[PDB]
Design a protein around this ligand. Structure first.
Ligand SMILES: CCCCCCCCCCCCCCCCCC(=O)OC[C@H](COP(=O)(O)OCCN)OC(=O)CCCCCCCCCCCCCCCCC
Ligand SMILES: CCCCCCCCCCCCCCCCCCCC(=O)O[C@H](COC(=O)CCCCCCCCCCCCCC)COP(=O)(O)OCCN
Ligand SMILES: CCCCCCCCCCCCCCCCCCCC(=O)O[C@H](COC(=O)CCCCCCCCCCCCCC)COP(=O)(O)OCCN
Ligand SMILES: CCCCCCCCCCCCCCCCCCCC(=O)O[C@H](COC(=O)CCCCCCCCCCCCCC)COP(=O)(O)OCCN
Ligand SMILES: CCCCCCCCCCCCCCCCCCCC(=O)O[C@H](COC(=O)CCCCCCCCCCCCCC)COP(=O)(O)OCCN
Ligand SMILES: CCCCCCCCCCCCCCCCCCCC(=O)O[C@H](COC(=O)CCCCCCCCCCCCCC)COP(=O)(O)OCCN
Ligand SMILES: CCCCCCCCCCCCCCCCCCCC(=O)O[C@H](COC(=O)CCCCCCCCCCCCCC)COP(=O)(O)OCCN
Ligand SMILES: CCCCCCCCCCCCCCCCCCCC(=O)O[C@H](COC(=O)CCCCCCCCCCCCCC)COP(=O)(O)OCCN
Ligand SMILES: CCCCCCCCCCCCCCCCCCCC(=O)O[C@H](COC(=O)CCCCCCCCCCCCCC)COP(=O)(O)OCCN
Ligand SMILES: CC(C)CCC[C@@H](C)[C@H]1CC[C@H]2[C@@H]3CC=C4C[C@@H](O)CC[C@]4(C)[C@H]3CC[C@]12C
Ligand SMILES: CC(C)CCC[C@@H](C)[C@H]1CC[C@H]2[C@@H]3CC=C4C[C@@H](O)CC[C@]4(C)[C@H]3CC[C@]12C
Ligand SMILES: CC(C)CCC[C@@H](C)[C@H]1CC[C@H]2[C@@H]3CC=C4C[C@@H](O)CC[C@]4(C)[C@H]3CC[C@]12C
Ligand SMILES: CC(C)CCC[C@@H](C)[C@H]1CC[C@H]2[C@@H]3CC=C4C[C@@H](O)CC[C@]4(C)[C@H]3CC[C@]12C
Ligand SMILES: *[C@@H]1O[C@H](CO)[C@@H](O)[C@H](O)[C@H]1NC(C)=O
Ligand SMILES: *[C@@H]1O[C@H](CO)[C@@H](O)[C@H](O)[C@H]1NC(C)=O
Ligand SMILES: *[C@@H]1O[C@H](CO)[C@@H](O)[C@H](O)[C@H]1NC(C)=O
Ligand SMILES: *[C@@H]1O[C@H](CO)[C@@H](O)[C@H](O)[C@H]1NC(C)=O
Lengths: 344, 344, 344, 344
């Protein structure tokens, strides 16, 4: 049913499942824009395939050949099945557009599934090769931030009654290596390349004459060759090709809307904005240094992932509360922090 | 079965699922009127699609063409499938109303699913882009309110035997920025625009002549062109078009009933009523200031979400009990609060 | 299968599911008579729809038209499907009873599902708009009653070795406002109105001539108009209309049995009986005042919901044990209470 | 499949599900004989319905009409479906036995499902109206018995190193009111009445001539009336009527075996036997009084439910161990109790 496919592929959490494992607990490991680009680019061809054969849009078989009236039921079934299998054998069928449109019309679901798989591959490579590396580091950074917050408020609480910037040094180190960022821009670049190839294929397929689904087929190989009761050629038509083209144009539109999103995603430093650690600079136990910007290096990628997963950090939430209050400038940062009383 | 679709789409918790995650625990993050508008505007086209092809309303195929009596079973099947695929090819079919009604009749389920998806998109954008931002802030506000209540009753209990309005300052800050409110009114405005476009389409479709489902179809392209045994044209009829129109008028009625609800939702300040924090003004540890009204700013949105999710706050419940008792004015607020004894 | 539908709609907990949420834990929030009225009025039309097309009661298609013998299989299928779609087009079919019976016969499942949905709507509005408001208040009242019981037995225990009637004042306040009660009687009144409209429709439908399922149909629009091989008119019959009428009379009987139940439910003060708080009057820490009767106000509704959900209250259970023992009058209330020793 | 229905309706826990709720934990609330009577009287008609249409016992359609040889496939299908729908219209069909056997043959599954539902109704009324009332009281009685046992062994333990019979007074009070017992005998009496009505109907139906499934049917209303190619009348036969009668006699046999069980259940005092509290009379902290017998009052019903659910009571188990040992009379009750050492 149409509504079942709708639920399964947009309303269900299709490709939105969090990693079912206690190693990454609440950690996203895939940027929201990347998760939605993957969800679209993968589920749309699948949702389109499932629609192209919805039981109410499909009239029946995928091909019909119009055997003569003298032909029995089973002879007509033979003609249909033979021509269906004969869209490959170029000698049997004669089509005005060519044999390539026939191949594309028969194997359109396979090609869409191929595009879905190829578009799922880069997110899979990211989830397996580079997601744990960033997950461990991000979990460590969040733990260290919570610890420095607790120590800062404990020092402030003792005042109301070591000191090494380890996380800052770790991020300074991340500023050097660029392995994770080249992995990220490589998976994004393969996603963009496959999306553009899919756009090219879908634009070509939609550009077909729309009469290329009608091909002349001749069951005259083998012992049927010099047979006389069988006519020389049959007029076959590939049903559901109009549906294929109407769905291919939808896929092409969505993909050419998605490609600018991927291209923008490709520029990872430009997206690093709203410096997340700047809110921590108001802590005594934390050095006054953001030092996170301007590079095609893993530091910018970590900045993005921190900007995403930082809302889970309670200390960040309270510090951002104080920072927003500081916009008015009524009281003072350490006083409001001591008032806070939120170690964990 | 009809009853299965009924269960799935009204009696089941379709699109009423709470976010399956411990980040938002009992927090709604979608106003009840917005949740019901989404549920209706999305499930109704899906429920209608599933009904339009219920096994007891569908007689069989979606098209029937009445081949001549001389035609065999398979030749008639070819005529049916050819004309079904030929509602697209404008050269083959001749219809009094035009080819556009034929397109709309064949692809009515697809268009309804498209409307369902487009109507689901703004709630999805709200759930992903702006729901966590409001969720963290609302959870922090509820925690701070419980904390101030506990501190107020502890001070009162010590009397029977810091002091910074942090949440008030946070809300004062929210009064300034308007990012969340423009996100909210933007998703609501896109919902209204898509609902109005769906109303326009459904009113047009229902306005079709009701004989536009009968089209004359000619299987005479290719080698069949100069064939003589095949008649010049066939009288095809698109079954289940009357069902499509009867369901389109239902969808249009429900949508023109839903559009005023969305328009009213669009006026977020007007809906901010029954000042929820006013009940907290009777606490000594809480400054005597509501300061939440009159603006197209995120403060009004936060007021709505607080009015919704505030029933989960135990301190709010007890304070509202005292406030309602105060209507009689028998005793006194601090005495009844000390009697209360409900820290958590 | 018949037995599967039987299980699903009477033997399963259909529409008897407790709210899957920790906000209301064991709280009913829907009076037993209201829950059963909803279950009947909603599941009966669904159970009837599912029966009307049980695979053993359905002979096959919903319509049969008796084409001539010369007509091929596919031509007869065209006649059947055309007339099925032509019960709408009033020009094609000529029926003695009229076109309205034909519409009602084709769309009987849709009309029953519509009645099921409309009858489910008021309980849904109650569950979403007014159920949490009463749930929070009822949970607070139960907690306060358990607390006053514990304090009374602690005072009695200290004797064997504040004092503000907060819940009594809260109920006195509830005695004033009538928002919840007008919401309740409004949902009940809409339920009664929809039940009466369903009774009217089902009584009309069952009153049909029982030969209105036989209609004369003419496939002579379009190019078939002046065709000669096709006969002027076909004798079609809507199968499963007798089943529809036999099920409509069952639905009408059950609904006219249900309507007095809803009318009685409408009189909420009359149903407030067996004063539940009267059992608490034997506590020293509880003022000697029931003060719950005689009004179209939210207090009577709260009395009903307390009478329903009060069995979950342990203190109420023990107090009712003592009250029943007091019928004999052998010992004394405070002595038996001290003996009780059931703080929680 | 037959074996699937067998599993579902005898081997599965069909209608043996414990109440899925923490209010009644291990409490039966339905006497074993009543639970089995309900299970039989409800699942047997359902199991019979599912068997009457098992895919291997059903040859195909439920009716076959033997159109002439000249009739096409679709004309014969029309005759079959018309006569199927025409068992209702008394003018069309002429049967030797009458139209009532035809009605009963077509709607036999519906009538069996109706009997299953009506037989499920009294157990449902008991489970909803009177089960919680007895559940709370029984749980309280079990808790009080465990408490009195603990206090008795604590007094005995202190000897080796208040005093109010509250549960006895509660049962003395139960001896007065008869609301629960009239509810119980009323649900049992409705069960017996419905079982007897089902026996009457099944004995009548099985008494049919077994040729009443063959009826003469005439498709000659409407424009077919004066038609000549259609014969005057068709010989239709309702297949699966022999299966219906063979299953109706099985249902009747099981029901006339079940009716004496229900009649015996109706005599609730006679079933109150093996005085369960008599085992508690050997406790010092428990008064020496059974006081539970001889009445059409709720006390006898509570005696039955205690006899059923008392095995869950650990104190009862240990006391019955001591009572059985006392049959030999070797030692002494208080000494063996002190030896016991089973407070909980
Ligand atoms: C007096 C009670 C009468 C009872 C009648 C009951 C009949 C049953 C009707 C069936 C309804 C379907 C079931 C859906 C129920 C859930 C809807 C709901 O809860 O609506 C609440 C909503 C409140 O609006 P909102 O802006 O959220 O403000 C409230 C909190 N600040 O409500 C609104 O205000 C939104 C819609 C009203 C806007 C005006 C409409 C045109 C302008
Ligand atoms: C991915 C998209 C693939 C589409 C593009 C393929 C490139 C084909 C380019 C060469 C075409 C070619 O060989 O010419 C035709 C033969 O094609 C053929 O017969 C080759 C068939 C093309 C293969 C397409 C089949 C798709 C299979 C994919 C399934 C994947 C499954 C994954 C799970 C000749 O004919 P003509 O038209 O020139 O004749 C009229 C005279 N010019
Ligand atoms: C917005 C995208 C619009 C795309 C339409 C551009 C193509 C126009 C071609 C003529 C219009 C038409 O109806 O004829 C067919 C296209 O129809 C169609 O197939 C148009 C159907 C429109 C579908 C788009 C609706 C949803 C878009 C996004 C949803 C989210 C031609 O057929 P042909 O292409 O074989 O002949 C190649 C001829 N140039
Ligand atoms: C969304 C609602 C879309 C409906 C409105 C589409 C705008 C069409 C306006 C132009 C119409 C047009 O080109 O005129 C007809 C051709 O239409 C055509 O042949 C174009 C076909 C229109 C596309 C509708 C197909 C719906 C596909 C959506 C599927 C989405 C799937 C999502 C999962 C000519 O014919 P005539 O009537 O003038 O001839 C008699 C002489 N005047
Ligand atoms: C309330 C909404 C009522 C809408 C009816 C307004 C249209 C009237 C047109 C004539 C009435 C009729 O029976 O003829 C067909 C409409 O029937 C219909 O299709 C009327 C069926 C009524 C369905 C509404 C019932 C449930 C409404 C909400 C449920 C929740 C015409 O057919 P046409 O429209 O193709 O010809 C275009 C002609 N103006
Ligand atoms: C709810 C129950 C609705 C039933 C009552 C509808 C009111 C109809 C009153 C007007 C009747 C009318 O227009 O007269 C007939 C046309 O009806 C028509 O052709 C109008 C059709 C009536 C609409 C019923 C279709 C039900 C659709 C509901 C589906 C809801 C789906 C929910 C998921 C003319 O004919 P005649 O008999 O006078 O001719 C013989 C000469 N007098
Ligand atoms: C309850 C049944 C109460 C009403 C039944 C009789 C109403 C009077 C007309 C009965 C005539 C009859 O038996 O012939 C057809 C079948 O009726 C029938 O269908 C009569 C028997 C119906 C069996 C219903 C069983 C009720 C079980 C309830 C359990 C809950 C009438 O057909 P028509 O109604 O079109 O003629 C309307 C013209 N007077
Ligand atoms: C429950 C068991 C119901 C069976 C007993 C029904 C009582 C019928 C007594 C009156 C019989 C009657 O009216 O006589 C026949 C008409 O019956 C009829 O045509 C009335 C039809 C009887 C209704 C039975 C249909 C069962 C429907 C129950 C479905 C429940 C669904 C629950 C989900 C006339 O004919 P004749 O034989 O005298 O002609 C030969 C000349 N004497
Ligand atoms: C033990 C119960 C036995 C019931 C049999 C008593 C009826 C005897 C009638 C003649 C025997 C026979 O074979 O003919 C058909 C009954 O067969 C049958 O239908 C007999 C089949 C026996 C089925 C019982 C087996 C399982 C019983 C309990 C299982 C647990 C008559 O057919 P008719 O009754 O239409 O003609 C009415 C004639 N008096
Ligand atoms: C990502 C964006 C740019 C994609 C836009 C669609 C492009 C790729 C589509 C739309 C129209 C298409 C063309 C339509 C027709 C022809 C003629 C044919 O003999 C060769 C292919 C060719 C030349 C197609 C190549 C692909 C094409 C240019
Ligand atoms: C939201 C509310 C206002 C929607 C009401 C339905 C509207 C959009 C519907 C109802 C009747 C419809 C009209 C009916 C007939 C025609 C004639 C046709 O040649 C062009 C479209 C046109 C002019 C339709 C446009 C859309 C229409 C005006
Ligand atoms: C709730 C109770 C009162 C419902 C009882 C059923 C009522 C509503 C039914 C039973 C018989 C029905 C009538 C039977 C026949 C006709 C004649 C027709 O030309 C107009 C409708 C009319 C007049 C029906 C109106 C509805 C009706 C009166
Ligand atoms: C619970 C026990 C007593 C049930 C035993 C089955 C009874 C109810 C059955 C068995 C035989 C049946 C009888 C068989 C034949 C006829 C003749 C018919 O013209 C009227 C009904 C009547 C008179 C039946 C009435 C019901 C009947 C007496
Ligand atoms: C069929 O007959 C033709 C006659 O020209 C001949 O050339 C060909 O070889 C024959 N093929 C078979 C399968 O006999
Ligand atoms: C069919 O015959 C006609 C005769 O006018 C001719 O014009 C046309 O080209 C022929 N087409 C084919 C497929 O041979
Ligand atoms: C059918 O023939 C009749 C003859 O009177 C004519 O009036 C009508 O216009 C014709 N219709 C078509 C579709 O040719
Ligand atoms: C059928 O013909 C007979 C001839 O006596 C006539 O009485 C009857 O009215 C006719 N019915 C129709 C439907 O024309």
């Amino acid at each position: 049913a149409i509504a079942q496919l709708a639920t399964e592929y947009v309303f269900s959490d299709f490709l939105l499942k969090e990693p079912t494992e206690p190693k990454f607990k609440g950690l996203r490991l895939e940027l929201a824009v990347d998760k939605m680009v993957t969800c679209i680019a993968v589920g749309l061809p699948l949702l389109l395939i499932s629609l192209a054969f919805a039981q109410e849009i499909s009239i029946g078989t995928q091909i019909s050949c119009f055997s003569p009236s003298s032909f029995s039921w089973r002879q007509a079934a033979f003609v249909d099945s033979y021509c269906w299998a004969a869209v490959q054998q170029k000698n049997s069928l004669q089509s005005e557009s060519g044999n390539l449109p026939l191949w594309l019309h028969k194997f359109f679901p396979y090609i869409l599934l191929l595009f879905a798989i190829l578009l799922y591959l880069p997110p899979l490579f990211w989830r397996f090769a580079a997601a744990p590396h960033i997950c461990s580091d991000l979990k460590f950074i969040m733990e260290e931030l919570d610890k420095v917050y607790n120590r800062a408020i404990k020092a402030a609480k003792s005042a109301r009654d070591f000191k090494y910037p380890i996380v800052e040094q770790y991020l300074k180190t991340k500023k050097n290596s660029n392995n994770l960022i080249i992995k990220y821009i490589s998976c994004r670049l393969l996603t963009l390349i496959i999306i553009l190839l899919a756009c090219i294929y879908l634009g070509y397929y939609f550009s077909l004459s729309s009469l290329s689904d009608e091909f002349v087929c001749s069951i005259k190989s083998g012992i049927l060759r010099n047979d006389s009761t069988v006519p020389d050629q049959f007029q076959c038509k590939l049903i559901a090709v109009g549906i294929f083209q109407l769905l291919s144009v939808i896929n092409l539109v969505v993909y050419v809307l998605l490609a600018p999103v991927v291209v923008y995603t490709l520029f990872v430093p430009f997206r690093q904005k709203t410096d997340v650690l700047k809110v921590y600079e108001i802590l005594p136990t934390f050095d006054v240094l953001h030092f996170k910007s301007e590079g095609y290096n893993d530091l910018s990628l970590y900045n993005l992932f921190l900007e995403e997963n930082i809302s889970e950090v309670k200390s960040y939430k309270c510090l951002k509360v104080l920072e927003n209050i500081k916009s008015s400038g009524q009281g003072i940062d350490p006083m409001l922090l001591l008032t806070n009383l939120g170690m964990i």
